[PDB]
Each structure stands twice: as structure tokens, then as C-alpha cells.
Amino acid sequence: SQIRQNYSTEVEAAVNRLVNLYLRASYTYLSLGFYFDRDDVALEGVCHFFRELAEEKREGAERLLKMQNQRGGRALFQDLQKPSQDEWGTTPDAMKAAIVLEKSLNQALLDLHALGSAQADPHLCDFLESHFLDEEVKLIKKMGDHLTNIQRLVGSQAGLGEYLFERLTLKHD
Amino acid sequence: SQIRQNYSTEVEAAVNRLVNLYLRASYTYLSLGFYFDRDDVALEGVCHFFRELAEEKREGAERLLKMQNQRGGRALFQDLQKPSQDEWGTTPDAMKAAIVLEKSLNQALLDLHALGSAQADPHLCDFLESHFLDEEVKLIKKMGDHLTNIQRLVGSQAGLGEYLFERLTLKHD
Amino acid sequence: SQIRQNYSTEVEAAVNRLVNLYLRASYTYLSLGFYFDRDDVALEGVCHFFRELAEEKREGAERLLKMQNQRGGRALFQDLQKPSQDEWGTTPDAMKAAIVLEKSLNQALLDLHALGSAQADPHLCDFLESHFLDEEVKLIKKMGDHLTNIQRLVGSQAGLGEYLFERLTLKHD
Amino acid sequence: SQIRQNYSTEVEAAVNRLVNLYLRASYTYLSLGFYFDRDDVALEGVCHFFRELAEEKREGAERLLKMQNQRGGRALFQDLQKPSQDEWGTTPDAMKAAIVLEKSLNQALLDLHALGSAQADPHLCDFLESHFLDEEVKLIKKMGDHLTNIQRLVGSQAGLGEYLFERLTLKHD
Ligand SMILES: [Au+3]
Ligand SMILES: [Au+3]
Ligand SMILES: [Au+3]
Ligand SMILES: [Au+3]
Ligand SMILES: [Au+3]
Ligand SMILES: [Au+3]
Ligand SMILES: [Au+3]
Ligand SMILES: [Au+3]
Ligand SMILES: [Au+3]
Ligand SMILES: [Au+3]
Ligand SMILES: [Au+3]
Ligand SMILES: [Au+3]
Ligand SMILES: [Au+3]
Ligand SMILES: [Au+3]
Ligand SMILES: [Au+3]
Ligand SMILES: [Au+3]
Ligand SMILES: [Au+3]
Ligand SMILES: [Au+3]
Ligand SMILES: [Au+3]
Ligand SMILES: [Au+3]
Ligand SMILES: [Au+3]
Ligand SMILES: [Au+3]
Ligand SMILES: [Au+3]
Ligand SMILES: [Au+3]
């Protein structure tokens, strides 16, 4: 093969697509982060939050690529589509966008799981379970918690609420 | 006995009942804590507050059980009734529920004191005085202080106030 | 949801039931422990053994509750039924009761696995596999080993055997 | 007085009697200890156990005497009657004698409590509660536990059982 064993072409292709989705997510977080770094937005904790996520998504893509080679599949790259927005609105708007994005990654993981199970590829299933599935669940829970707190704050009064959330919940210098 | 001395059947039974009340209190705090851990509630400091109290009430029950055996009484366990609510409302609602619960434990301690005094059981009285009575008074004072602060904050505006109390008064990561 | 994804109502309910089973197990171990602390039983190592298990079962329940919220399910609590006995007999009687209890928890885990697999919920399966299944297998093996040793000892002569097992196998001060 | 306040002659006398009882207990433990040091008895752990108790009872007497002077009472000493036996039999015989002795001290403490309460002497009650009542309860519990273990062992077979208890339960070099 010289190493490929029990690794379907279907899974190989799906893994390449998942790499693209993770890299696109990383790119979206890069855009989110720099938006919050604008002098007319200026929420450092929010920038920091999304910058860390950009790194996390890139790391996920890299782990997938490492696994592709470990199994004897061939990494193939496609264009990275630009993020869906150029401007990201308020903190709740951005957190909602983030949750939508993570749910889409999670669904792709679940779809790849289903394919792995169909193809009887337990190494793939173990890989997703060990490095991806719980990471996504934890992240989405954190995002939901954040969204609840931001919504509670901006419903009281928006400017003040956004400031307090960035200062008191998010990590900043 | 071989060890039982000056330990009435009345006190023995009352101690078993008090164990049940402390364990039920622990269970109520477990429910309170996880309620505040919900993604649609998301007040970590409040969860932490009640989680610590769950541990404290369990420890109280365990001390009572240790004492039961020290005196040569027989520990007897009954069902632990589920907590009185499945959902606990707002931070002030939960703090009020907590104060009601602690006052009920305190009254049970006082009732056991009265029984001890009636039965001329100074070891029991010393035990309650040394490990329970002041702990309850201190806890109830803290709860009252908390309730006053939360009420002051949510009367200004509720969402904002609940967030600020959780961030600035309660212990969180 | 705002976070719930691929999490069936069937699994949500089963998780609540499993929390109840773990808490009931914890309660049974609390009773076992204090029984061995009786002055007319007086086997400290046995008390210590069951006290540690009470903590372990409570921790299991708490992990399940954390997961319930991570997935966006709603924790619901029911009564904790009192343990099945008030007095627990000899060390072998108690160890047998413990094995029966652990096998019942293990079967509940396996049943939840089956449900997870039926519902195509790999996060649930990963969770059970990572935090529960091997813990149960290890514990049951230890219990079986203990039971074999106690049986070997009490068949030689009971009082002496029970003492030696508590002194030389079990952890004590 | 120049210092005596709220300290009845009844309590003063009872305290002197209690000093005598504690010193007599100390003397009994001295005899118990040296009995187990006999070459034809030779149970070092048992000797050590009773030697420590002799010290504890003497310390109790000394605390009582200190309190007598703190309150402005006059310490008065009487003969210390020799212990009730010259030879103390087997380990269970000795442990039974010890429990009888401690129960008698505990009853004397309780009687002094009753007198204190009758005389409205809260300093006396606090003193007994803080330094004596729980110490006695703890000691008697330990003795009961010991007796249960020794009885379990000597009912299997006496010589072997006595050796094992001294080696594996009691503190020795
Ligand atoms: Au940035
Ligand atoms: Au920045
Ligand atoms: Au930044
Ligand atoms: Au799979
Ligand atoms: Au598979
Ligand atoms: Au956020
Ligand atoms: Au909590
Ligand atoms: Au929490
Ligand atoms: Au918490
Ligand atoms: Au009292
Ligand atoms: Au009293
Ligand atoms: Au509070
Ligand atoms: Au125990
Ligand atoms: Au114990
Ligand atoms: Au123990
Ligand atoms: Au499964
Ligand atoms: Au599954
Ligand atoms: Au065992
Ligand atoms: Au000696
Ligand atoms: Au010696
Ligand atoms: Au010695
Ligand atoms: Au008194
Ligand atoms: Au008094
Ligand atoms: Au002894």
C-alpha cells in the first residue's frame, strides 16, 4: 500500500472535506477576532476569545491531516472560502455566528462517524471520539453559557452590558 | 451495651431523623447547583456556591452518623425525598429557598437541643453546640447578606444585577 | 436549542435514571460503611472501603449530571430509595451485596450504551467508555478478588478470618 | 474571696472527689500495664495501651486541680485506694475491666454536670464539656471496638487471637 489497511476511499475523501471545514472555521475566527480589534469596536476580550478559537480550529485541521497520512490516505486541499460576513455586529451576533459554526462542525463530525461505522473503521471512530467529539460538546456548552450571559446583559442595556461581559467574563490583559 | 450510656431512644431516633434532613438538604443543594449550570441559566458562581453547600450538608450528616455510633445508637436510613422544585428561578428565588432550608435545619437542631436538655444528655448538647449551632448561624448570616445584595441589584435592573452579583460577590474561575 | 444537538429524549431520560441509580448506590455504601463502624462490628478497613465507594458513586452521579447539562438535557431528580438492608451481616455478606450492586450499575451502563448505539449518539458512547465502563470492570474484579480471599479465610475459621482480612488486605489507620 | 465567684461548696467537694477517681483510674492503668509486661504474660501492645491511659487519667486529674484553683476552691487529697485486682487475666478480661472503669468515670462526670446545672455554674459545665465528656465518649467507643475485635479473635482460638490482636491492632515497637 504500503501501509493502508481498512481505510476506505469514502472516509479518505470525507476527511479531506473535514480538513477544509476546520480551516474555513479557523479563517472565520480570524475575521471575527480582527473585527473586535477595530478601534470602533474595541472589545479586546472578544478578540482574544476568537483568536484562541482560530488556533484551535487550525490545530484540529492539522490533527486530521496527520491522521490522513497515518492511515495512508492522500491529503488534498481545496480553496478556503472567505467567511460569510465582513462585519460581525454586536457581541451576541458574533457569539450566535460562532455557535452556528460549531454546530456545523459537530454535525460534520457526526456524519463522518456514521460513515466510519458504516465502513467498519474503528480507528477512525476512536480518533473522532478521542480528539473531536467531546471538544466540540465542551466548546458549544461554553458558547451557550456565554450567549446566555451576554443576552442577560444586553437586555438590561446594551453598551454597558457588552462592556461588562468583555471585562468580567472574557480573558484580557 | 456494650458502650451505650445516658443515650435515650428518643435522642437516638431524633438523630436518625436529623441525618435524613441533612442528606435531603445536601440533595436540594445538588439540584440547585446543577440548575445554575444549565446553559440557559449559566451562573457559575451560583453553581459553585450551592455545590459547596451540598458538600457541607453531607459532611454534617456524616458527623451525626459518626456520633450515633460513638454513643452506641443504631443508624437507620430512610428514603431521601426529592427536592421541592425541579427548576429554581432567579438568583434571589434560589437564595430565599436556601435560607428557608437552613432555617428548617436550624429549627431541627434547636428541637434536638431541647430534647437533649430534657433527657439530661450534655454530650449531645456539647456536640450540637460545637459542630452545628454556630455553623448554621454563620451560614444564615451569609445568606441574608447575599439576599440583601442580590435584592439591591435586581431592583436596579434584573439581568445586569444577577450577572454582577455572580461575578463580584460569588467565587468563580 | 440553544446547544442541544443529536441528543435524544430517550437518552436524556435514561441519563436521569442512571444518576438516580448512582446516587442510590452511594447511599447504600454510606449505610454499609457506618454499619462496619458499629462498636459491635468494628471493622475499620471495611468501613473505609465502603466509605471510598460512596464517594466514587457520588462522583459518578455528578459526572453524569455535568454531561446532561453539557448536552443541553434537563437534570431531573427523583427520590433516593433507602438501601435494601438496615444491617449488613458479615464481611462476605457485605462484599456479595456490593458485587450485586455493582453488576446492576454495570448492566445499566450497558443498557444505556445499547440505547446510545440505537440513537447513533457517539458522544454518549465515548463518555460511558471513557469514564464508566472500565471503572466498573476494574471495581468488580477487585470485589471478586476480595470475596475469594474472604471466603478462603472464613472457611478456615470465621472470626479470625474476618479480622485478618480487614487488617492485612484492607486499608486502615 | 479574693477570686471565688459563683462556685459552690458542693461543686468544690465534687471536684475533689473527681480528682480522686481520676487518680485511682490512673493507678489502675499502671497496674494493668505492668501486668502485661510480666514475662509470663508478655503482650507489649497491651502494656503500651494501658500505660498511655494511665498518663491520660493523670492529666485529667491535673486539669481538674488546675480548675479548682482557677475558681478559688481548695484542692484536698484523699488516699488512693489500690486497684481492684492484682492480676488481670486475659486481654478481653482487662479490656472489660477498662470499659467498666471508664463508664464509672463517665457517670461521675455526668453527675458533676447535673450538680453544675443545679447550681447554675456554666463555667463548670463548659469545662466538663470541653475537656472531658467527648474524650470519655471517644475512649469508650475505642474500647468497645477493641473488645469486639478481641472477642471475635479469642472465640476462634484464644492464644493465637490474643497474639494477633496485640500485633496487628495495638501500637508496639
Ligand atoms: Au483578535
Ligand atoms: Au485584540
Ligand atoms: Au485579541
Ligand atoms: Au463512528
Ligand atoms: Au466505527
Ligand atoms: Au463568547
Ligand atoms: Au454546580
Ligand atoms: Au457550574
Ligand atoms: Au459550579
Ligand atoms: Au441542649
Ligand atoms: Au443538655
Ligand atoms: Au447567595
Ligand atoms: Au465508614
Ligand atoms: Au470507620
Ligand atoms: Au472507615
Ligand atoms: Au454505545
Ligand atoms: Au454510540
Ligand atoms: Au472487600
Ligand atoms: Au506497661
Ligand atoms: Au511493656
Ligand atoms: Au508497654
Ligand atoms: Au452541666
Ligand atoms: Au451548667
Ligand atoms: Au484494648
DSSP chain B: --S--S--HHHHHHHHHHHHHHHHHHHHHHHHHHHHTSTTT--HHHHHHHHHHHHHHHHHHHHHHHHHHHHT-------BPPPS-S---SHHHHHHHHHHHHHHHHHHHHHHHHHHHHTT-HHHHHHHIIIIIHHHHHHHHHHHHHHHHHHHHHTT-HHHHHHHHHHHTS---
Q: Which of residues 138-157 of B touch C (CB under 8 A)?
A: none
**Chain A residues touching B157 at Cβ < 8 A:** 156-157
D166 labelled ligand-binding? no
**Chain B residues touching A171 at Cβ < 8 A:** none
Lookup result for grid cell 474524650: D135
| Segments of C9-148 assigned E as strands | none
Touching partners of C (3+ C-beta pairs < 8 Å): A, B, D
Are A and D neighbours with ≥3 CB pairs closer than 8 A? Answer: no
Q: Cα–Cα distances in Å, from A161 out to A97, A170, B90?
A: 19, 13, 18
Which residues span the domain enclosing A124? 1-173
For residue B3, give the nearest of C47, C155, C39 by alpha carbon. Answer: C39
For residue C69, give the nearest of B71, D84, B41, A22 by alpha carbon. Answer: B41
Number of domains chain D is built from: 1
B5/D contact by beta carbon, under 8 A: yes
> In angstroms, rounded to a whole number, what is the distance separating the alpha carbons of residues A11 and A108?
12
Q: Which three cell numbers stand for residue D35?
A: 501486668
C52 labelled ligand-binding? yes
Contact between residue C26 and residue C54 where contact means Cβ atoms under 8 Å apart: yes
Distance B4 CA to ligand 13 centre (A): 19
Reduce the DSSP state of residue C27 to 3 states and report it.
helix
**Chain C residues touching A106 at Cβ < 8 A:** 5-6
Q: Produce one character per residue of B9-43: b if its CB has 16 or more CB atoms within 10 Å, e if not.
A: eebbebbbebbbbbbbbbbbbbbbbbbbbbbebbb
Q: Cα–Cα distances in Å, from A66 out to A18, A23, A24, C126, C168?
A: 13, 14, 18, 22, 50
Provide the shortest C-alpha distance from residue D57 to chain C (in Å).
23
Beta-carbon contacts of residue B149 (< 8 Å; ≥ 6 apart) = B165, B169
List residues, by chain if needed, whose CB lies under 5 Å from ion ligand 24: D 95, 146
Distance A170 CA to ligand 1 centre (A): 13
D137/B contact by beta carbon, under 8 A: yes
Beta-carbon contacts of residue B52 (< 8 Å; ≥ 6 apart) = none
Q: CB A92: neighbour CB atoms within 10 A?
A: 20
Distance D1 CA to ligand 20 centre (A): 47
Structure determined via: X-ray
A103/C contact by beta carbon, under 8 A: yes
CB atoms D164 and C159 under 8 Å: no
C78 → closest Cβ in B2, B78, B82:
B82
> In angstroms, rounded to a whole number, what is the distance separating the alpha carbons of residues C137 and A7?
31
Are D and B neighbours with ≥3 CB pairs closer than 8 A? Answer: yes
Contact between residue A104 and residue A21 where contact means Cβ atoms under 8 Å apart: yes
Which of the ligands is closest to the CA of residue A48?
A: 3
Distance A129 CA to ligand 16 centre (A): 12
> In angstroms, rounded to a whole number, what is the distance separating the alpha carbons of residues D48 and A128?
62
Q: How many helices (H) and strands (E) does chain D have?
A: 6, 0
For residue D140, give the nearest of D172, D113, D110 by alpha carbon. Answer: D110
Touching partners of D (3+ C-beta pairs < 8 Å): B, C
Distance D48 CA to ligand 20 centre (A): 6
> In angstroms, rounded to a whole number, what is the distance separating the alpha carbons of residues A54 and A28?
8
Provide the shortest C-alpha distance from residue C8 to chain B (in Å).
17
SS3 assignment for chain A: CCCCCCCCHHHHHHHHHHHHHHHHHHHHHHHHHHHHCCCCCCCHHHHHHHHHHHHHHHHHHHHHHHHHHHHCCCCCCCCCCCCCCCCCCCHHHHHHHHHHHHHHHHHHHHHHHHHHHHCCCHHHHHHHHHHHHHHHHHHHHHHHHHHHHHHHHHCCCHHHHHHHHHHHCCCCC
C23, C52, C64, C80: best to mutate for the B interface, most B CBs within 10 A = C80
> In angstroms, rounded to a whole number, what is the distance separating the alpha carbons of residues A24 and C26?
47
> In angstroms, rounded to a whole number, what is the distance separating the alpha carbons of residues B12 and B23?
17
Contact between residue C98 and residue A169 where contact means Cβ atoms under 8 Å apart: no
> In angstroms, rounded to a whole number, what is the distance separating the alpha carbons of residues B52 and B54?
5
Q: Produce one character per residue of B129-168: b if its CB has 16 or more CB atoms within 10 Å, e if not.
A: beebbebbeebbeebeebbebbbebbeeebbbbbbbbbbe
CB atoms C2 and A99 under 8 Å: yes
Contact between residue D46 and residue D170 where contact means Cβ atoms under 8 Å apart: yes
Contact between residue A127 and residue A67 where contact means Cβ atoms under 8 Å apart: yes
Query: CATH number, domain at D51?
Result: 1.20.1260.10
Dihedral angle at the C-alpha atoms of D124, D126, D130, D131, nearest 10 degrees? Answer: 0
> In angstroms, rounded to a whole number, what is the distance separating the alpha carbons of residues C30 and C20?
15
**Chain B residues touching C30 at Cβ < 8 A:** 62, 65, 77
Distance D172 CA to ligand 24 centre (A): 13
CB atoms D134 and B122 under 8 Å: no
Dihedral angle at the C-alpha atoms of C44, C48, C50, C51, nearest 10 degrees? Answer: 130
> In angstroms, rounded to a whole number, what is the distance separating the alpha carbons of residues B94 and B92?
5
B27/C contact by beta carbon, under 8 A: yes
Distance D62 CA to ligand 20 centre (A): 25
B126/D contact by beta carbon, under 8 A: yes
A110 → closest Cβ in C3, C6, C129:
C6
Which of the ligands is closest to the CA of residue A37?
A: 2
Q: CB B4: neighbour CB atoms within 10 A?
A: 16
Q: CB B115: neighbour CB atoms within 10 A?
A: 18
Contact between residue C69 and residue B34 where contact means Cβ atoms under 8 Å apart: yes
